[PDB]
């Protein structure tokens, strides 16, 4: 297990890919949640250029936090984890937007509002355990 | 630090009160949560008498889950817990609701839908740290 929350230092760019692999820690009755930050700085409080929170069971949202403000929010009902089990999560930075990879599904894309080259820090939190986190690149 | 999620088996009555002190892990701008849930059984799939999800900074939702269906959910905006610091949260048991202190002022009360002498376990998770648990009586 990777301590929860797990924060890494991280650069991006038109290529990369982070890759999550974890579990909920309670059955999608309960609704676990799961939330990855693509944060400007090291610091929790910075902004977020791209915000993924998984309501297990229920939903999908997507944001970004600029200067501290919450923008547009966008919902997806998609729901590829499966309840008790563990998930493959692969976000892809693509040239116009993100690509979020479910057990190696296409699930939910987000275009870029920063330059993905803003990002210095991922956050993965709330009601998983983690067993691998991994910034890679093509 | 107990482990969260934190499961004790516990009966209340009249009397009862259930003190948690605890913190949340982040700062409130990414807006942590802390669910507390009395279950009629031991297993986390089992029915909820009394539902408490603080999303810190923003809102306060209690309910009940009932043969599996969520009932009538109730808000409060009422937020007594403060940015960055440990709270104590005290949940009493009154002949007709539950009565919630946050750090000695009553914050939420819930007007039981069920007997709590149906309550066989609470479950304190989300994203805090738990430092105290107790179920007592007056
Ligand atoms: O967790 C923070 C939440 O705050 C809301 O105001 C945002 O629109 C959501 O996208 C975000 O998930
Ligand atoms: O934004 C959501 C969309 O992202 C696409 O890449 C997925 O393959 C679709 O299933 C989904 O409708
Ligand atoms: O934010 C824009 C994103 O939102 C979704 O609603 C669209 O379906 C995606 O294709 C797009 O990348
Ligand atoms: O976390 C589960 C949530 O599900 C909703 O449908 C309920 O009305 C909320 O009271 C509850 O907080
Ligand atoms: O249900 C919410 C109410 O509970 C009361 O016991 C609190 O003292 C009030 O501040 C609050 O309006
Ligand atoms: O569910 C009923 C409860 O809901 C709140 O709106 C009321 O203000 C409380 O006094 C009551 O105990």
Redesign the interface.
């Known amino acids: 297990l990777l301590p929860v929350?797990y924060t890494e230092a991280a650069s991006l760019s038109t290529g990369s890919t982070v890759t999550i692999k974890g579990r909920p820690?309670?059955?999608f009755?309960?609704e676990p949640?799961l939330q990855v930050?693509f944060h400007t700085e090291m610091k929790?409080?910075s902004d977020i250029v791209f915000h993924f929170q998984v309501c297990f069971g229920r939903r999908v949202v997507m944001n970004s936090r600029e200067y501290?403000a919450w923008k547009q929010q966008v919902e997806s009902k998609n729901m590829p984890f499966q309840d008790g089990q563990e998930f493959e999560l692969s976000i892809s930075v693509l040239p116009d937007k993100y690509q979020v990879m479910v057990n190696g599904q296409s699930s939910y894309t987000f275009d870029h509002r920063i330059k993905p080259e803003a990002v210095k820090m991922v956050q993965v939190?709330?009601?998983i355990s983690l067993t691998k986190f991994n910034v890679s690149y093509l």
């Open positions: 929350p820690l309670v059955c009755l309960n949640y930050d929790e409080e501290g939190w709330r009601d």
